[PDB]
Write a protein that binds this ligand. Structure first.
Ligand SMILES: CCCCCCCC/C=C\CCCCCCCC(=O)OC[C@H](COP(=O)(O)OCC[N+](C)(C)C)OC(=O)CCCCCCC/C=C\CCCCCCCC
Ligand SMILES: CCCCCCCC/C=C\CCCCCCCC(=O)OC[C@H](COP(=O)(O)OCC[N+](C)(C)C)OC(=O)CCCCCCC/C=C\CCCCCCCC
Ligand SMILES: CCCCCCCC/C=C\CCCCCCCC(=O)OC[C@H](COP(=O)(O)OCC[N+](C)(C)C)OC(=O)CCCCCCC/C=C\CCCCCCCC
Ligand SMILES: CCCCCCCC/C=C\CCCCCCCC(=O)OC[C@H](COP(=O)(O)OCC[N+](C)(C)C)OC(=O)CCCCCCC/C=C\CCCCCCCC
Ligand SMILES: CCCCCCCC/C=C\CCCCCCCC(=O)OC[C@H](COP(=O)(O)OCC[N+](C)(C)C)OC(=O)CCCCCCC/C=C\CCCCCCCC
Ligand SMILES: CCCCCCCC/C=C\CCCCCCCC(=O)O[C@H](COC(=O)CCCCCCC/C=C/CCCCCCCC)COP(=O)(O)OCC[N+](C)(C)C
Ligand SMILES: CC(C)CCC[C@@H](C)[C@H]1CC[C@H]2[C@@H]3CC=C4C[C@@H](O)CC[C@]4(C)[C@H]3CC[C@]12C
Ligand SMILES: CNCc1ccc(OCc2cc(Cl)ccc2OCc2ccccc2)cc1
Ligand SMILES: *[C@@H]1O[C@H](CO)[C@@H](O)[C@H](O)[C@H]1NC(C)=O
Ligand SMILES: *[C@@H]1O[C@H](CO)[C@@H](O)[C@H](O)[C@H]1NC(C)=O
Ligand SMILES: *[C@@H]1O[C@H](CO)[C@@H](O)[C@H](O)[C@H]1NC(C)=O
Ligand SMILES: [Mg+2]
Lengths: 983, 268
């Protein structure tokens, strides 16, 4: 394209001038023809649309349907003949209010997260230098058009996609756009065929680090590379979260059970002489009854508590559903530059005394240092400190050395920070050796030189320090400083040097050679006139000091975080735009490639055979570059992914990152993506959960992400995985607890319709159970500790391991809720008989009992009752059934603390929140029972003490039965009992 | 999910074992529930209820009981006999259970005092109940007037108190029925009533009630209120209260506790 074309071939497509630029009129016409040089802002979404999205979801839709059914049944009953139909209105209002309040809470969570994240986004106007009809003036960046001749210098952001016409030592920072970590040279010569790998193209939004450059604007606005990436990210659709899928599966289970029960009892009501309309109303009532009211609030509160715990560790989720995806994650596709690494060149290895040392590269310097007690080291440190022009910006003392801002090149910055960390007071050491001559780095010499004076006044010798490319230095330096002695080069030092240089290069590191040469007093006395244009000073026969290599090193917590993720069964794949050698070296450093793992190239090198001769099954590690990936079909990509457990993708475009994520998801995996730059925004959007760095992350990446690491701490991924697994287990427990009580709320109504006993439980007291007494105990189960080493387990199978499954539903409903129903009916019949109504008289009593025209109905003793007195007795039955359910739910919350361990093992009082929730539940029950006015406000009665005691043996039975079940599970793993009775 | 080999994700043999487990579980739970009910009924006293929390004051009912849409509403036409034929039939059917043939199981009662019985000295291990016969209602007994005064415009209303085991209304004087206009006619005079038995009292020897097992022949004492100055072609509200020391009629949530309130309209 524009980079493969010549200056003659160009300068006519855009009607411009390589020397004079564009005419002003033509620039105006082009600024009309195309848009301003900027990216269109995202369409966004109105705040009311964002709020309305919170009202959707599987559980919300089930509740909306239930409310609609309530209203339709109300219409039928009111249109036929029926009074006392306020229960339908109460249920519909409760459902709608829960949905709306939960939506408001989720909207508040999203608003808070968005504000916290956007507080890190600032705004600065952008201006550019342009040349038109020979003039040169500073114009706004969005005013530029295609064909504009522009000027760039060090420290200025590149204003558009530019084909470089002339350059003088120009280097750019492409780390956000590509994966490249080192500064890249821009030259006016084409060096590749892809525009993303050629040195004659500068990219919009990148930073010019040093030097000057001129060129023509060849792409603008959304047609730039970053604009194309943004457009690609816009076309990626965000799929539903694993937790949302689990909730939808749970809704399917609930709907199936509701329909089955409703149809069965519709048939029963037909068989016992009800009309079709009444039986249909009964079916609708049962279907609505199976829909839990407070479960949505409980789930939302649990997710919010997990989000609060994560935010305590500077890990912010943009939506509540994202707090579980890491727990479900089986594959992590991680970006390298800026995500696994610090995106900052740092001294890593030093070769002196015929040995390769290792420097501390951690940003907090909490690492392993090297031996700094050698004469060769004390000379090498002096050389690298003196032969350096970099300088810190003033006013930096409390800022740590790695994060301090310095003025100079990346290599000189790394050398200066290394001097400050190892020697200390590099500025003082440099000023104590005054400089009398200096030669800057140039493309021909490929070295930098300077002559200084020694600190001690006794010594008049001038020290010469030289820094440059390793071979361009070793061509000089006939002597070498070994163990504090100046040895000559006997073809053995020249091969040790070559081996060290090749090893450092193969470690993906940039190497510099250092040397010194003290000047004799006779030949160069003090006051000697050193001339840079005469080369009077000696430039050969120096004393080689050592090699220093630099790399963009991993963040401090990254290697241990990767190790923990792999221990948790999670596959970690590096996907980077950087070069394969650096990518492989970093992958080995951070544990993505294990010690001893080899690629096919490594196996071939060891076995002295061609690559195709080896077996790809023997190679655990694999490195695939973007060019190989482009010629790879999905079948072969899947084959490579399955064949090589430790995988590195290098030279990977944003589209190719998207393709890799899509392939991993197509294999059935739940995929997490961690990235920082614009090049991983599409992959971040496509991932099941996108994680972006907060400090290092670009705006596009943070917008695409679901989770933001504010402090750029990668171990927060491990924290997220642990919290996700814990919240999955605890949500399972909380849901089982919530579902248990639905059966004792429904069975009294079924008995009321079919057997015609006086109503044992009212709609108001059911609402109190659902929304006031059990929400706090259900939420308190979110504080349960893990029952095993949750971080040594494999990720759950998404197809088989469901949040709510058949054993959980069947146990919670038809064993525990059945016991609770029996307790409730025992208390019901006790309270009825002790007040004069025997059970057999209760059977079939409903029409007379509810008849407003009967004011002397006889009880079992022949006593005559008014309707009001019978109604107060009915409220007493409501209260005893309520208290039975509450007493059994205390034991239920006790047994839901664990799924396998005993309550004695886990601890009864370890969950202080659970203990407080139990106390609060009992207190609210007592308040409802014995507050004055309750019989006529909420229809709760001041029941006698013995009706508190009746359900207690049933609660004890619940606890004992669950303990025996879990003991059977623990003692007989793999048995029929474990397969059928464990949830 | 359904398949020949593994039906609903479970083999046929496994379905047998899981169904057997659930059957055993429900049989055990039903047995526990039946045991609890058996223990309850073994601890229940057959003659006296354990508690009377909702029966602190007796309800009051009225015959003939005709309801509108908010309570009792009686409306007929002295000219048109078919309007009160149903009312007089209701009164006749209610008083059928107070004939001497229906009262053969009770004994004569004259003490005018609490019939406290601490032993089972009646036949078949019961306690004595005292007779109440229709002729105690004099003109409102259905003879010699089979219309109960509805034809003449002075209808009889039978007022009966709900019976409560061992309840005592108070022995300083017999409990008494008092009927009056709820809101007195600003033009007409106050309600004039003639009561049968005289003074509208329930004799104290009908109390206490010992329940249906001890007194299977018990009959609630009755008071007949003959209303004598009801205006014609006009809605009136009548309230009949029970006057006794232990009977209260101030319950805002039960309008039948201690009193009965009906609407009355007599057309000419
Ligand atoms: C969060 C959103 C959840 C609930 C908030 C809405 C409140 C419950 C939804 C129903 C709305 C409603 O209208 O509910 C009314 C009942 C009490 O009605 P009442 O006895 O005053 O009616 C007197 C009229 N008469 C005499 C005809 C019966 O309130 C109740 O059941 C409240 C039941 C307990 C709700 C606790 C919610 C805690 C969160
Ligand atoms: C309808 C219900 C009404 C009543 C609701 C609660 C009212 C207030 C009652 C209690 C508040 C907390 C009192 C704490 C006192 C004990 C002192 C303590 O030592 O505790 C401090 C806790 C420490 O944590 P930990 O050691 O327990 O964690 C261990 C488990 N690990 C590490 C795995 C997470 O600090 C924390 O937990 C964070 C702060 C406390 C949060 C837990 C309390 C529950 C709050 C909200 C949930 C209820 C929502 C209400 C209904 C909403 C419907 C939409
Ligand atoms: C953590 C442990 C539980 C804490 C619970 C909250 C504690 C703080 C709440 C205080 C509010 C209640 C203040 C005291 C109320 C009672 C005294 C009073 O002054 O109230 C009297 C009147 C009517 O009573 P009475 O004696 O004339 O009727 C006789 C009723 N006998 C026969 C039926 C039983 O009550 C009325 O009219 C209206 C007042 C009714 C009482 C509140 C109504 C519901 C308000 C909040 C509860 C929301 C659901 C939870
Ligand atoms: C409330 C009332 C509830 C009443 C329920 C009645 C249940 C009747 C008894 C059920 C017996 C279940 C049983 O006999 O299962 C035997 C199976 C055999 O498996 P396998 O040897 O082929 O597997 C070997 C591993 N492989 C496959 C790799 C070779 O599994 C096993 O042996 C595992 C160990 C069996 C025992 C586990 C606990 C069973 C206890 C049940 C009592 C439940 C109520 C307790 C009282 C309630 C509170 C008062
Ligand atoms: C999925 C499987 C569900 C199974 C549910 C349970 C099925 C069996 C339940 C009831 C059927 C009858 C069997 C139980 C009979 C009760 C036990 C018993 O032998 O008692 C003895 C009494 C007779 O004594 P008496 O009065 O002559 O003595 C008077 C003594 N003196 C005079 C001193 C007071 O016999 C009686 O009361 C008979 C009256 C008992 C029945 C009352 C009405 C029950 C209706 C509905 C309750 C259902 C609850 C279901 C909860 C779980 C749902 C999942
Ligand atoms: C875990 C922390 C627990 C902290 C303590 C809980 C709060 C305690 C505060 C107040 C309770 C006492 C004051 C209210 C009762 C007197 C009002 C009244 O009048 O009740 C009277 C009955 O009283 C009694 O039988 C004696 C008192 C017993 C009260 C029940 C016990 C409540 C305690 C529950 C805690 C259970 C804990 C163990 C299980 C859970 C373990 C985790 C009702 O009169 P009646 O039915 O005869 O009238 C009927 C006539 N009619 C209807 C016209 C009014
Ligand atoms: C017969 C009455 C008492 C009810 C049935 C009792 C139930 C709970 C008992 C009796 C027979 C038992 C089964 C006997 C056979 C098998 C198959 C074996 O591979 C695992 C145990 C298992 C699955 C048992 C499960 C529990 C069981 C079904
Ligand atoms: C967790 N679910 C709570 C829950 C449990 C049980 C239940 O029973 C139905 C029911 C009970 C009572 Cl007391 C009164 C009225 C009732 O239905 C009225 C009705 C409602 C919808 C359609 C048609 C009719 C209802 C909700
Ligand atoms: C019924 O009462 C009305 C007055 O409300 C009267 O006109 C009519 O004659 C009475 N009935 C008969 C059939 O006499
Ligand atoms: C009951 O006593 C009354 C009044 O003495 C009497 O008229 C009546 O005959 C007695 N009952 C009998 C024996 O039928
Ligand atoms: C009841 O009938 C008697 C005669 O049998 C009579 O003296 C008395 O006045 C009548 N009372 C009324 C109001 O009918
Ligand atoms: Mg990056």
């Amino acid at each position: 394209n524009d980079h493969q074309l010549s200056v003659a071939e160009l300068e006519q497509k855009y009607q411009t001038s390589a020397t004079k630029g564009l005419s002003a009129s033509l620039a105006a016409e082009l600024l009309l023809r195309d848009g301003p040089n900027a990216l269109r802002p995202p369409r966004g979404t109105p705040e009311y649309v964002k709020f309305a999205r919170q009202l959707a979801g599987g559980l919300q839709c089930l509740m909306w349907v239930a409310a609609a059914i309530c209203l339709i049944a109300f219409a039928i009953q009111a249109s036929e003949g029926d009074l006392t139909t306020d229960d339908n209105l109460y249920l519909a209002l409760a459902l709608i209010a829960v949905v709306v309040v939960t939506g408001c809470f989720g909207y508040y969570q999203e608003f808070k997260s968005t504000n916290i994240i956007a507080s890190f986004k600032n705004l600065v106007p952008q201006q550019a230098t342009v040349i038109r009809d020979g003039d040169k003036f500073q114009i706004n960046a969005d005013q530029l058009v295609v064909g504009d001749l522009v000027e760039m210098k060090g420290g200025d952001r590149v204003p558009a996609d530019i084909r470089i016409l002339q350059a003088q030592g120009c280097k750019v920072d492409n780390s956000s756009l590509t994966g490249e970590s080192e500064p890249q040279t821009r030259s006016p010569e084409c060096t590749h065929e892809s525009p993303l790998e050629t040195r004659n193209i500068a990219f919009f939004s990148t930073m010019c680090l040093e030097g000057t450059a001129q060129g023509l604007v060849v792409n603008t606005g959304d047609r730039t590379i970053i604009g194309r990436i943004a457009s690609l990210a816009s076309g990626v659709e965000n799929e539903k979260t694993p937790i949302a899928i689990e909730i939808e599966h749970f809704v399917d289970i609930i709907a199936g059970l509701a329909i089955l029960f409703g149809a069965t009892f519709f048939i029963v009501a037909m068989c016992i002489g009800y009309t079709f309309l009444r039986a249909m109303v009964f079916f609708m009532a049962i279907v609505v009854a199976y829909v839990p009211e407070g479960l949505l609030a409980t789930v939302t509160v649990c997710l919010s508590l997990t989000a609060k715990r994560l935010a305590s560790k500077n890990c912010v989720v943009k939506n509540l559903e994202a707090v579980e995806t890491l727990g479900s994650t089986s594959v992590i596709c991680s970006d390298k530059t800026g995500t696994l690494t610090q995106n900052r060149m740092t001294v890593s290895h030093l070769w002196f005394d015929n040995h390769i040392h290792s420097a501390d590269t951690t940003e907090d310097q909490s690492g392993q240092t090297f031996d700094q007690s050698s004469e060769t080291w004390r000379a090498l440190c002096r050389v690298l400190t003196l032969c350096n022009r970099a300088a810190f910006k003033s006013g930096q003392d409390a800022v740590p050395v790695p994060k301090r801002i310095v003025i100079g090149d990346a290599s000189e910055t790394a050398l200066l920070k290394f001097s400050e960390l190892t020697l200390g007071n590099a500025m003082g050491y440099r000023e104590r050796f005054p400089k009398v001559c200096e030669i800057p780095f140039n493309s021909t010499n490929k070295f930098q030189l300077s002559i200084h004076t020694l600190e001690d006044p006794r010594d008049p010798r001038h020290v010469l320090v030289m820094k440059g490319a390793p071979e361009r230095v070793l061509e000089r330096c006939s002597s070498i400083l070994i163990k504090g002695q100046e040895l000559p080069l006997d073809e053995q030092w020249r091969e040790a040097f070559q081996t060290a240089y090749l090893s450092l290069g193969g470690l993906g590191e940039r190497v510099l050679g250092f040397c010194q040469l003290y000047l004799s007093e006779k030949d160069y006395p003090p006051g000697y006139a050193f001339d840079v244009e005469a080369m009077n000073f000696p430039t050969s026969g120096l004393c080689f000091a050592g090699l220093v290599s630099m790399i963009d090193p991993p963040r401090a917590t990254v290697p241990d975080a990767v190790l923990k993720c792999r221990t948790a069964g999670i596959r970690v794949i590096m996907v980077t735009g950087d070069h394969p050698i650096t990518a492989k070296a970093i992958a080995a450093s951070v544990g993505i490639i294990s010690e001893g793992s080899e690629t096919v190239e490594d196996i071939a090198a060891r076995l002295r055979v061609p690559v195709d001769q080896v077996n790809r099954k023997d190679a655990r590690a694999c490195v695939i570059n973007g060019m190989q990936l482009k010629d790879m079909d999905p079948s072969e990509l899947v084959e490579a992914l399955r064949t090589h457990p430790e995988m590195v993708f290098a030279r990977t475009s944003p589209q190719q990152k998207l393709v890799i994520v899509e392939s991993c998801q197509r294999l059935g995996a739940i995929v997490a993506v961690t990235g920082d730059g614009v090049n991983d925004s599409p992959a971040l959007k496509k991932a099941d959960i996108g994680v972006a760095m907060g400090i290092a992350g670009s705006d596009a990446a943070k917008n695409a992400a679901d989770m933001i690491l504010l402090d750029d701490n990668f171990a927060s991924i491990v924290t997220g995985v642990e919290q996700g697994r814990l919240i999955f287990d605890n949500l399972k427990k909380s849901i089982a607890y919530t579902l248990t009580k639905n059966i004792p709320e429904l069975t009294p109504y079924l008995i009321y319709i079919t057997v015609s006993v006086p109503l044992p439980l009212g709609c108001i007291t059911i609402l109190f159970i659902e929304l006031c007494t059990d929400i706090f105990p259900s939420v308190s189960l979110a504080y349960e500790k893990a029952e095993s080493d949750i971080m040594h387990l494999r990720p759950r199978n998404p197809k088989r391991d469901r949040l709510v499954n058949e054993p959980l539903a069947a146990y919670s409903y038809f064993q525990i809720g059945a016991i609770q129903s029996f307790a409730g009916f025992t208390d019901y019949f006790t309270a009825m008989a002790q007040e004069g109504w025997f059970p057999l008289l209760c059977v079939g009593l409903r029409p007379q009992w509810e008849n407003h025209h009967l004011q002397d109905l006889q009880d079992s003793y022949g006593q005559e009752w008014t309707f009001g007195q019978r109604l107060y007795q009915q409220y007493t039955c409501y209260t005893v059934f309520f208290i039975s359910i509450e007493m059994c739910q205390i034991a239920d919350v006790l047994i839901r603390k664990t799924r396998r361990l005993s309550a004695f093992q886990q601890g009864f009082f370890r969950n202080r929140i659970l203990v407080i929730a139990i106390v609060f539940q009992v207190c609210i029950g007592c308040f409802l029972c014995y507050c004055p006015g309750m019989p006529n406000i909420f229809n709760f009665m001041p029941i006698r003490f013995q009706w508190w005691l009746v359900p207690m043996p049933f609660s004890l039975l619940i606890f004992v039965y669950d303990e025996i079940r879990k003991l059977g599970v623990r003692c007989c793993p793999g048995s029929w009992w474990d397969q059928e009775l464990y949830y | 999910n359904p398949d020949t080999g593994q039906m609903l994700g479970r083999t046929l043999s496994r379905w047998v074992w899981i169904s057997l487990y659930y059957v055993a579980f429900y049989v055990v739970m039903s047995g526990i529930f039946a045991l609890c009910i058996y223990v309850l009924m073994r601890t229940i006293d057959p003659y006296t209820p354990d508690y009377q929390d909702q029966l602190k004051s007796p309800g009051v009912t009225l015959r003939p009981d005709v309801y509108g849409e908010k309570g009792l509403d009686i409306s007929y036409n002295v000219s048109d006999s078919t309007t009160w034929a149903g009312l007089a039939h209701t009164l006749h059917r209610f008083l059928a259970g107070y004939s001497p043939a229906a009262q053969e199981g009770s004994i004569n009662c004259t003490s005018e005092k609490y019939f406290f019985q601490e032993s089972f000295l009646a036949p078949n291990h019961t306690k004595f109940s005292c007779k109440f016969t229709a002729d105690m209602l004099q003109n409102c007994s259905g003879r010699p007037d089979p219309t109960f005064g509805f034809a003449e415009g002075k209808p009889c209303f039978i007022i009966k108190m709900n019976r409560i085991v061992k309840f005592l209304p108070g022995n300083s004087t017999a409990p008494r029925v008092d009927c009056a206009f709820l809101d007195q006619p600003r033009d007409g005079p106050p309600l004039q009533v003639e009561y049968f038995p005289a003074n509208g009292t329930y004799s104290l020897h009908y109390f206490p009630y010992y329940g249906k097992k001890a007194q299977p022949h018990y009959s609630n004492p009755l008071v007949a209120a003959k209303l004598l100055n009801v205006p014609r072609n006009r809605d009136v509200v009548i309230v009949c209260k029970i006057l006794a020391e232990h009977v209260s009629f101030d319950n805002p949530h039960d309008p039948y506790e201690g009193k009965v309130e009906f609407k009355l309209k007599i057309q000419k």
